[PDB]
Design an enzyme around this catalytic site. Structure first.
Site, PDB file in Angstrom:
ATOM      1  N   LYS A 114     107.675  21.977  76.799  1.00 45.47           N
ATOM      2  CA  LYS A 114     109.038  21.993  76.294  1.00 45.47           C
ATOM      3  C   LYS A 114     109.617  20.586  76.347  1.00 45.47           C
ATOM      4  CE  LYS A 114     111.476  25.099  75.704  1.00 45.47           C
ATOM      5  NZ  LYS A 114     111.826  25.810  74.441  1.00 45.47           N
ATOM      6  N   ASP A 154     115.036  25.233  69.207  1.00 47.66           N
ATOM      7  CA  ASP A 154     115.696  25.904  70.312  1.00 47.66           C
ATOM      8  C   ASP A 154     117.189  25.582  70.222  1.00 47.66           C
ATOM      9  OD1 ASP A 154     116.149  27.438  72.529  1.00 47.66           O
ATOM     10  OD2 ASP A 154     114.849  26.303  73.880  1.00 47.66           O
TER      11      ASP A 154
END
Lengths: 460, 460, 460, 460
Positions: A114, A154
């Site tokens: 991430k 995201d």
């Protein structure tokens, strides 16, 4: 090991995983796995870089970008990108750590990672977004590759940011290929991809609760809470409506919204679409209670979370933000007789709340016990569709929506079945006290990843 | 801009695109698109290099190789290769521009671009071809890549040159992969691929005219003209025969060849196959008119074009070379009652011819008007099959001929119903007035490319 | 051969080189060299790219960037960078072609090449310069390398643009290395360089003329014309002052500035320093003639050049722009009894002027003939110092100023010795008739380059 | 910026730099430099990776490697490597930050960076060292290059670790080049260097005081305190003896070692050699105090530092560890009449101590004021030779010791003597009151770096 810094979120997640592992007899059967935990908990590689860009006035702005690559045992570092002013190394490590086990359980071959930045997309013009994206992809392009690191979208990253990032990547590498997730259909995009990005967590939570209800006295007739608004929460409410349930106390970041008639009324799909429009335009839902749509229908609470004043609900779907549930929220839910708590996000409940739920579950020897679902078992979906888009981009051929949805159905069923099988193997169900399917999911993910690393030689 | 050189072909193509765009209200609805025109007009990258090779007498020969990479917004720089003694930068830029818009209208992801060389394959033994190919791929291998640039075949580049180029690429890069288009079946090849390319171009021309006839009084009965000989021309004649049409004026480069009985006679497939054999053999059509069959069937005119001496035909299919139809040819066709003019090449009509056709279409309202079909809407097909070959090579799994043809049918229907749909929609014509195919095609291709570049951040 | 475009400047330079070669008996002694000219005249690699940047208003601007790599037989593609609105492929090819032989004569390794852009640095703020530089180095970084291509500074490229380009290069490659010449001393710069860029050209011109004066009747007492101004003409005037000569008329872009008293007056270094200040400030010399120190000493002419009205001059130093000398101005100079014409730039004289000078030189049997010096013999110096900077950067050791100046003195002396040697060797004159410098320099440069290419295997 | 984690050491260093800058009129003269500080304070690139290796028992150990690349404006990321169990991101960021300005003041072209690991070399056999080095260089090799990142030696990294790291680097890259500092003479090493590191640090710390004496009442006759021992402090004592000083409290980490007769007696030069022997042997100074040679000479204090019990000394050379001097120790020194204090390490004194020294300096109007020297002007020295390395490696030619020492002498002059010059120029002193040498060094280093980054284009 006193030199390591204090990262609260990652430490909490890791401690919960270790406690869940120690709870079972996993280390009594395979004591060798104790060192596998020590190896997994250290990320393979994290890169922090400085992003220097320019705003409209011509000043110089200095943000920092990150790229955490926790694990690539099961597959490439395919992760995400989160542009939020609260992003630091701790929360990125936490999200990557959860990604590892979510991808393990789902059965797909992907790694845990991430990235993101402290960029605040709120109040930045389109030019500012483009400038930051170009600087970010200038400083990041070395550390990613089409089959090395594949970021995604995201919070704070949408089609716009993805477009700018892909444009700069193509400009730098001089190689048009599939290296990030979220592209539009005109340039190596996927069908279902936006709908999946906004709907996979919804599908997973709904199906997970419908499966945890043991196939009797389903969603229909049971009050449901949906904390948070937009992306997940909206479609979670939409599907619980389609399944015969009623949305009761959907809220936002700023405040809460509870229907006055919590027993004989609900949030209608039109209202949810209105909130979707408001959240796309960055408007609080408190503006809706001003209008007659909500004024006679929903009561707005400023800085209140729905849990304390649910009104005797039975299903809870926390999908707002990390640590949106505490012990007192758990007390409110049990006073409400809530018997199915399932997170719609990552670490959506405090550790104290987890302890309360587990204690209450052990107390009731029967179906009357509460059951807690981890965020890893839920959510998913979007990861599967990102993998599907990667396969499409590698094969240079676009599929149709039917094929992608068939693959998604297979993946979600496979994830449910893998969790259930590991519940059979290690959670060891029996009639009476309900098993801890949190333990099942944790054990499944950890054991899969540990075996894959042991074969490859990451530990021994 | 005074420093900018003069490139007549590219200048003509760009001028026609700009005039078509400004004709519509596109720049009035979206005035932001005016700068997108300025950005597209400049190629992303043009690479010219020197190729020094050796002939069969040990004498140093110097040629030039080019690789125009016009635009890669929609996808990788897949192009072609054209070895012809007339290839300069202007011709390559013009062909790359048309590639961009054809791939836009297609719906496939490929990007615009085209390379080639000043090599003259006529009268060079296989040794000279191999030597030039090895030198050319020695000097080109850096700039192209397995995904970056994917060249193909064209005039002068048959399977033999493709084989030699791929051999040298494999020798240099030391990585067997799909990097150029046209490879044989034994190594990373597609079914029908070169035949598929030519046949698809032909398909596009015939079906485009068939549904420009509004699906009444089709090819059958209406006389057809085909200028040029080989690939596009030959199979265009074959398919119009299959559709019940009548080939009338099959031509070539040096001269023409017109059947004496233009009404009650045609071209049998055997004679067209004879033309095919002699054109692969680097011969002239004048040799056949000496033989009895052509002597009793057709008459040869030297250095004459079919248009003025065809015999009152209704449709025409220019497929020989650029600017093969001037204003006087337009007058000849309209006196001939030609009501459907459509080229099987790129810029097959001189600007005067386009003006004449547009004026005739405007003045004569109703179905009794001439219709001009752009070369971009036509042709195509081969690009789709090349993309299919690239997909096959990337997946490392060869397909079946039926599978490739089914996917090609889907792609051609997409692009081609798209051409007709944009003709009847984006032109938005009057009833009776014929939907301008040129306007619709140009607008669609531009708008697609412009939006894809705007999101990617190539302009704003 | 008809497909090649028209490039007037490069064609003129190539024609002059070929005519000079055919003048001598070089092709009779070594007829093998006739095929080396065909190979040399084609650049090894030409790369044109699109540069899209943004101005302060926030509008998309599109320029073209180029990088001509003409030859690398003797050494790497070290060249320069010229940001000027008049830059196109022709002018860059011409400059690279001259660079080849200038680097050949100097005895150093570097090869012939030249880059640049259509950028107009006049009237662009600092932000615009930085943005264009970043875009330019983004699109150019692949093609250059730490050794492959080493650009430099030129017209339009100062220390500021070099700084921005190097800042972007280090950001992309992520490797601080000496990939371009012209940086400041703090990040791997060179001493005897910021002024030496033009001071070397100045040295070359004056020492070349002094050696063409045959060691008597020196600079002192001879009227000198120095056309143009900026970085070359100013310090040329300074050095001719140090040598006892009197500056007579220094021109500019717009017109000329000629002292009234051509015999008993000159240009003081203070006034020339003022010219330098205004030229750095992008002003015009037309404004100084208002000030008394210039009002009573110089006069300004609008759109006039010094050549036709200096009056009875004997030394000429055209150092303004290409093709700044015509045949008529040559005849004006002969009317002035001029006996030494030597360019301070590249192709500073028209071909007609060259013919006139050669005819005049052949007419006079003795020392009382005009002598024309090639621009390749002159200029130089700056190239040598840039190569010295590259050597310093590779060795990672910044030499002392005295050491760099000693090496530069050695290099310039060697180049002068080689030029005079070939002038007395292959021109091979008789007593009295002067050893034509143009023939000597052309023959030497071509012969050296051709031999290096023949041994390396660029022609057989 | 609340998300930014808490790094005590780096925060202290940055706060001291900012306070020094705000103290002067730097930001009133050049207010634009205020935004350069926000850019320098963020590292260009921080890379953390997991190192998994194996000990003798066959178990699995997991460590963390780091590589901070703080700045590259002045030159490549040439830094160091320290394997210490206390290494975390804060310590490495602080050390790199100090490296930036030390390399700025030194005049050499070197960037600011520092790597290392949590590896504990104490108690690891040779096999463990080799295994960890191989794993570390496997995980680090892709992030460095011969002219991208060049590590070196430091605490915990000696010739052995450097040898193993270079052995693995050559194996991976398959290219023998100079990519790290510390190699032996047989493989691309430097003369003087194994001495030169500590010897040059000593040179700096001692002649910095020698020139802060204002060239009267020198080292001779003044008691000198030496906190810590090994590498630096030992030779600091040795050459202060050579300069005529008297070592009186030469100490170590665990405890103190102070001669009884701190006034008339002194440390033996051989005694410090004994300390060196046992410190290489990994022993303690207490065991020497057991032997008679130290038993009748020095009093050992456990867990005590020399500062409180110096015995009215006048010169202080803290060279043990960060924050080895506090405010109370500062007041002990003032009670001791100490007048010249200079660190031998990085932030050898606490901020409170710095405030105490500054207050005492301002209180006294004359030579009686205490003078505090920064660790940047001091220490260093070794970095000069460390950069006077890899130049022989790129040149492939080694230098004799005399040449290396001559270049080092030039560098120490231009850094250290010019550092006292900077304290005499930009600290803008006046007669009587002593200027702030800390302020001068800090400002000079910062301004040099800021100007370089400004022209490179890092800010504007």
């Amino acid at each position: 090991m006193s030199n390591l810094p204090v990262e609260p979120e990652f430490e909490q997640a890791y401690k919960e995983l270790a406690s869940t592992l120690e709870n079972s007899t996993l280390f009594q059967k395979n004591p060798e796995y104790r060192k596998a935990l020590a190896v997994v908990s250290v990320p393979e590689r994290v890169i922090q870089f400085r992003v220097v860009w320019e705003n409209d006035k011509g000043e110089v702005q200095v943000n920092r970008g990150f790229r955490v690559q926790f694990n690539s045992a099961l597959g490439p570092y395919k992760g995400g990108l989160r542009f939020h002013p609260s992003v630091n190394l701790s929360i990125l490590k936490f999200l990557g750590f959860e990604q590892i086990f979510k991808n393990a359980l789902t059965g797909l071959n992907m790694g845990g990672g991430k990235g993101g930045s402290d960029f605040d997309p709120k109040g930045k013009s389109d030019s500012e977004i483009r400038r930051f994206c170009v600087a970010f992809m200038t400083e990041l392009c070395r550390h990613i590759g089409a089959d090395t690191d594949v970021p995604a979208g995201d919070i704070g990253v949408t089609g716009r940011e993805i477009g700018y990032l892909f444009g700069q990547y193509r400009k730098l590498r001089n190689s048009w290929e599939g290296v990030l997730t979220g592209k539009g259909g005109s340039w190596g995009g996927s069908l279902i991809r936006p709908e999946a990005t906004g709907y996979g967590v919804v599908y997973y939570v709904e199906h997970m609760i419908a499966h945890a209800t043991n196939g009797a006295e389903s969603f229909a007739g049971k009050r449901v809470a949906i904390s948070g608004s937009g992306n997940v929460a909206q479609y979670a409410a939409l599907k619980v409506i389609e399944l015969g349930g009623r949305v009761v106390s959907l809220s936002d970041s700023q405040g809460s919204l509870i229907v006055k008639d919590t027993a004989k009324d609900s949030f209608t799909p039109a209202e949810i679409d209105a909130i979707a429009a408001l959240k796309v335009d960055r408007k609080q839902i408190a503006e809706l209670v001003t209008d007659a749509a909500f004024a006679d229908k929903f009561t707005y609470l400023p800085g209140q979370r729905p849990w304390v004043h649910v009104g005797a609900v039975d299903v809870a779907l926390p999908s707002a933000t990390q640590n949106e549930v505490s012990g007192e929220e758990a007390q409110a839910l049990i006073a409400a007789g809530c018997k199915f708590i399932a997170e719609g996000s990552n670490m959506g409940c405090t550790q104290a709340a987890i302890d309360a739920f587990e204690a209450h579950r052990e107390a009731n020897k029967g179906a009357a016990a509460i059951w807690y679902a981890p965020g890893k078992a839920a959510n998913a979906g979007g990861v599967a569709v990102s993998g599907l888009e990667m396969a499409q981009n590698s094969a240079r051929l676009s599929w149709t929506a039917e094929e992608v949805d068939a693959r998604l159905k297979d993946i979600m069923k496979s994830c449910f079945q893998n969790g259930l099988d590991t519940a059979k193997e290690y959670a060891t169900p029996a009639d009476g006290i309900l098993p801890s399917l949190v333990t099942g999911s944790n054990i499944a993910g950890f054991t899969k990843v540990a075996a894959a690393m042991k074969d490859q030689g990451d530990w021994w």
